[PDB]
Structure formats: C-alpha cells, structure tokens
Design a protein around this ligand. Sequence first.
Ligand SMILES: [Zn+2]
Ligand SMILES: [Zn+2]
Ligand SMILES: [Zn+2]
Lengths: 148, 104
Amino acid sequence: LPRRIIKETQRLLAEPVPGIKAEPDESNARYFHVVIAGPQDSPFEGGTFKLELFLPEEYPMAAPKVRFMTKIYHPNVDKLGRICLDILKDKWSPALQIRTVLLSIQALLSAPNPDDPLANDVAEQWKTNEAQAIETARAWTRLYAMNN
Amino acid sequence: QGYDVEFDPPLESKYECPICLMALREAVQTPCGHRFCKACIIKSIRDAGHKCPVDNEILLENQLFPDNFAKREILSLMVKCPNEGCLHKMELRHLEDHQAHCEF
Ligand SMILES: [Zn+2]
Ligand SMILES: [Zn+2]
Ligand SMILES: [Zn+2]
C-alpha cells in the first residue's frame, strides 16, 4: 500500500478529527468507515452519521470517493448518497488529504450550500422554506441517525 | 518518493513534501514559494495538471528550480535506524553507511 496512505492512516488514528471517527477496513486499507457527529447547534445535532470513503488507485492524484450512507435531509447530499463538494469534484489537489475531506464534510453539515442547480426538492426547500426544511432535517435525524 | 525514515525531532512541515508526505528528496521549489520532491511535483504536474497543488498557481516544468539550501538542511537532520535493535541515530546523509553496513 502506498506509503502516503499508510502515513495518513496512522496520523488519522493517532490524532482523530474531533467529532469524527474514521478507520480503515480490516480487509482493505483503501476503504474507510467514517462516522460524523451531527454538528452542535445544527439541525443534525444529537445524530450520528455514517459515510464510506474510498481511495482510488490514482490517489492522491485523484480525489477520494465518498458516499453518505445515513439518510439525511441536506441540500448537498442526494438520495444516492452522493455528496456535492467542490474538493471532491473540481477542486481536488494532491496536496489535499483525507483529513481535509473529513473536515470539509463536517463543515458542510454546519453550513449547507443550497446554491445548487437542483439538489432535488431539498435545495429550494432550504432556501424558500428554510424553517420547514430545517425541522425536517431535525426529524430525519431522530428517525435515522439516533442508532436503534 | 521522499525520505521515508523517522526524524528526531519530528520532521518540520517546512521540509515535508505535500505529495508523498515524506522528507523532500532532491528538493525543488516553485515560483510561488512551494517545495516538493523533484519526482513528486513532476508526477503531479503530469497527472494532476500544470498547477502548484498547494495554491493552484499555474506551474510549468521549466519553472521548477533546485532548492539546494533545503536539500542541504534535510541531509543534515538526525534520523534513526529503520528497524528495532539498533539505538544509534545519524544525519540522514550518513544513514547509507548504516543501512547494509551491519549484520542482517
Ligand atoms: Zn504554490
Ligand atoms: Zn515527495
Ligand atoms: Zn542500525
């Protein structure tokens, strides 16, 4: 396994991102099981959100692949779990790291970006019905991100 | 393809290659002030585009220049043997004479 990946993994386990649990799969070190605590003060507070992160063979020349597994009511996460994040699409650089992605996704939960050309019937609801959308994200949190 | 050995004290970030995360090997610097292993930045330029990965500034191969100053400093950093048993530490440039100059 590429030396850089080993080093990033060791550093993520040694010094983890607060509110973020991220560990490599026991059978494949390019596969990371991720868990992000819902940001304090955000409509996702109290919830635990699961994601899967994959390091393609070209990493770090190619961006990591990330899929949001836990059902969430957010403008930048579609039903297929795809995440709309610039550094995962057009702004990736070999200088960016897994930590960068993790921190960036965590921030996305605190600062939703409804400035999407669609993002389904969730983006517009967040802008032209913010109060309701937020309460819906809150309900989804208790319904799907509270374990059980 | 940088220097994969543990330094003592820890390698300062200034000498860490942002591509391989190892100590700069044949350090080069860009017009925008960033440093990389020669091979790493060339690879990045060829596979990730003609840009400095740190700040996205346009970067061309002919603009990469040697950073013999950083190279000199790195080679003088203290390192430790890559295997339990030995307790000796030496300047990176003197590790070679302590790589296969032992038993097994
Ligand atoms: Zn630069
Ligand atoms: Zn390098
Ligand atoms: Zn030794």
